[PDB]
Structure 1
Amino acid sequence: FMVELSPLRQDFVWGTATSAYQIEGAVADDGRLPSIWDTFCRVPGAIDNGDTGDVACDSYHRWPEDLALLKQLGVDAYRFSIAWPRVIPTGSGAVNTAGLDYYDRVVDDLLAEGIKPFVTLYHWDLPQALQDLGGWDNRDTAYRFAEYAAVVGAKLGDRVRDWVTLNEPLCSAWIGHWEGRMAPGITDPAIAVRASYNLLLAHGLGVAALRDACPEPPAVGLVVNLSGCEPASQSPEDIRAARIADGHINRWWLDPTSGRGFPADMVETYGVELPERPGDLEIIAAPTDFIGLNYYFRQIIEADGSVPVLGFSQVPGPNAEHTMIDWEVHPAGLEELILRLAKEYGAEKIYVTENGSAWVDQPDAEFAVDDPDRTAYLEEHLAACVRAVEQGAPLAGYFAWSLMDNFEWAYGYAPRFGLAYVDYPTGTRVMKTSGKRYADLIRGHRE
Structure 2
Amino acid sequence: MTKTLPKDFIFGGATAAYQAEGATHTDGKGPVAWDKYLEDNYWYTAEPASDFYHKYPVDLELAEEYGVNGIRISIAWSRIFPTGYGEVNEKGVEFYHKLFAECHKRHVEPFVTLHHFDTPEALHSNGDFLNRENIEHFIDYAAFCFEEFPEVNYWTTFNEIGPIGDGQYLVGKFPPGIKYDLAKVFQSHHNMMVSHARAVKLYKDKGYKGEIGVVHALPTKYPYDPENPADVRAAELEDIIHNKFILDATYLGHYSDKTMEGVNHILAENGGELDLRDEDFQALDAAKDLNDFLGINYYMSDWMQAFDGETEIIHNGKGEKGSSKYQIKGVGRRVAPDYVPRTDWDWIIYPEGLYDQIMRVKNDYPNYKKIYITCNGLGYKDEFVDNTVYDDGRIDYVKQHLEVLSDAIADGANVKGYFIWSLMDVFSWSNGYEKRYGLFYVDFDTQERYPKKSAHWYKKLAETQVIE
Rounded Cα–Cα distance in structure 2 between residues aligned with 1:147 and 1:430: 40
- CA apart distance, 1:85: 0.7
- The residue identity in structure 1 corresponding to 2:177 is G
The Cα offsets for residues 153-192 of structure 1, whole Å up to 9 and x where unpaired, read as: 1111x22111111111011112212221112212233233
Rounded Cα–Cα distance in structure 2 between residues aligned with 1:77 and 1:212: 27
TM-score by length of 1: 0.93
**Which consecutive residues of structure 1, in runs of 5 or more, have no partner in the other structure?**
none
Rounded Cα–Cα distance in structure 2 between residues aligned with 1:343 and 1:140: 36
Whether 1:357 aligns to 2:349 is no
Rounded Cα–Cα distance in structure 1 between residues aligned with 2:65 and 2:175: 34
Rounded Cα–Cα distance in structure 2 between residues aligned with 1:329 and 1:209: 39
1:244–1:61 CA distance, 2 compared to 1 (3 A): same
- The residue identity in structure 2 corresponding to 1:351 is Y
1:265–1:3 CA distance, 2 compared to 1 (3 A): farther
1:220 equivalent in structure 2 = 212
Contact map agreement 1:4 1:383 (CA 8 A) in 2: yes
2:440 equivalent in structure 1 = 420
- CA apart distance, 1:65: 1.9
SS of residue in 1 equivalent to 2:349: coil
How much is the aligned-residue C-alpha RMSD, in angstroms? Answer: 1.9
SS of residue in 2 equivalent to 1:70: helix
2:92 equivalent in structure 1 = 99
1:66 equivalent in structure 2 = 59
Rounded Cα–Cα distance in structure 1 between residues aligned with 2:337 and 2:55: 39
Pairing partner for 1:343 from 363, 376, 385: 363
SS of residue in 2 equivalent to 1:186: coil
Contact map agreement 1:324 1:415 (CA 8 A) in 2: no
The Cα offsets for residues 274-316 of structure 1, whole Å up to 9 and x where unpaired, read as: 3222321232341201111000011011112222554311111
Pairing partner for 2:113 from 100, 120, 123: 120
Rounded Cα–Cα distance in structure 2 between residues aligned with 1:327 and 1:56: 23
1:332–1:74 CA distance, 2 compared to 1 (3 A): same
The Cα offsets for residues 329-373 of structure 1, whole Å up to 9 and x where unpaired, read as: 11111111112122221121011000010123111263x111000
SS of residue in 2 equivalent to 1:410: coil
2:22 equivalent in structure 1 = 25
Contact map agreement 2:12 2:417 (CA 8 A) in 1: yes
2:426 equivalent in structure 1 = 406
Rounded Cα–Cα distance in structure 1 between residues aligned with 2:186 and 2:349: 30
Contact map agreement 2:15 2:423 (CA 8 A) in 1: yes
2:277 equivalent in structure 1 = 277
Count, aligned residues: 437
Whether 1:185 aligns to 2:177 is yes
Matches within 5 A, 1:122-161: 122-156=115-149, 158-161=150-153
- The residue identity in structure 1 corresponding to 2:14 is A
**Which consecutive residues of structure 2, in runs of 5 or more, have no partner in the other structure?**
312-327
- CA apart distance, 1:420: 0.8
Matches within 5 A, 1:248-287: 248-262=241-255, 263-268=259-264, 269-271=266-268, 272-285=272-285, 286=287, 287=290
1:10 equivalent in structure 2 = 7
- The residue identity in structure 1 corresponding to 2:213 is G
TM-score by length of 2: 0.89
Whether 1:392 aligns to 2:384 is no
- CA apart distance, 1:12: 1.7
Rounded Cα–Cα distance in structure 2 between residues aligned with 1:429 and 1:119: 23
2:325 equivalent in structure 1 = none
